[PDB]
Amino acid sequence: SPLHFAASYGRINTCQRLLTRLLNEGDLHGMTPLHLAAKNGHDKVVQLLLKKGALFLSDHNGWTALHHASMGGYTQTMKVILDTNLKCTDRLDEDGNTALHFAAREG
Amino acid sequence: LEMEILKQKYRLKDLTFLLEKQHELIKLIIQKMEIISET
Amino acid sequence: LEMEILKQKYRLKDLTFLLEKQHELIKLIIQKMEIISET
């Protein structure tokens, strides 16, 4: 819960102090700390979580951290995501949408 | 009516810009805020 | 209709004034806020 809150709200100093069953654990919606940090647009928290060996997972709806960063239009978080693993760009959600679909739909 | 509508559109654009700045500031407040008793 | 457009413009001006006051207040919050754990 504290790690999820800190990732979701960009409190990086708390994230560094709190840090792998905790790095890749979701909540009742399946969102890992990377998912929440990408969703709220904290590219530094995402970068730190990735350097600690967090894996690009999928939540209950199949969205990736890149899916959540594209829905919010966080270009810096997306750059951080794309410069580490060039294999999450074309992942498919439950309805068959990609990160490009969400970015185009959200304007 | 067109002049009034365009002026209102400009006002709405300025309001949107200010509200986005405010949103970023509030996010920064949450980032830097002390949470002790309500952790 | 002129009436509706002008009343809307008055409402939008009041909204802009209130949002500017809110923005100044949030800036003051950041000015006076305690930053220890997230410094």
From Swiss-Prot, chains B, C:
It is linked to Episodic pain syndrome, familial, 1: An autosomal dominant neurologic disorder characterized by onset in infancy of episodic debilitating upper body pain triggered by fasting, cold, and physical stress. The period of intense pain is accompanied by breathing difficulties, tachycardia, sweating, generalized pallor, peribuccal cyanosis, and stiffness of the abdominal wall. Affected individuals do not manifest altered pain sensitivity outside the episodes. Homotetramer. Interacts with TMEM100. Interacts with EGLN1. Interacts with the scorpion wasabi receptor toxin at the same site that electrophiles but in a non-covalent manner. The gene is TRPA1. C-terminal helices from the four subunits associate to form atypical coiled coil structure; this region is probably involved in binding the inositol polyphosphates that are required for optimal channel activity (in vitro). Belongs to the transient receptor (TC 1.A.4) family. TRPA1 activation by electrophiles occurs though covalent modification of specific cysteine residues in the N-terminal cytoplasmic domain. Residues 3-32 form a coiled coil. The lineage of its organism: Eukaryota, Metazoa, Chordata, Craniata, Vertebrata. It is found in: Cell membrane. Ligand-activated Ca(2+)-permeable, nonselective cation channel involved in pain detection and possibly also in cold perception, oxygen concentration perception, cough, itch, and inner ear function. Has a relatively high Ca(2+) selectivity, with a preference for divalent over monovalent cations (Ca(2+) > Ba(2+) > Mg(2+) > NH4(+) > Li(+) > K(+)), the influx of cation into the cytoplasm leads to membrane depolarization. Has a central role in the pain response to endogenous inflammatory mediators, such as bradykinin and to a diverse array of irritants. A 1,2-diacyl-sn-glycero-3-phospho-(1D-myo-inositol) binds at residues 7-13. This is Transient receptor potential cation channel subfamily A member 1.
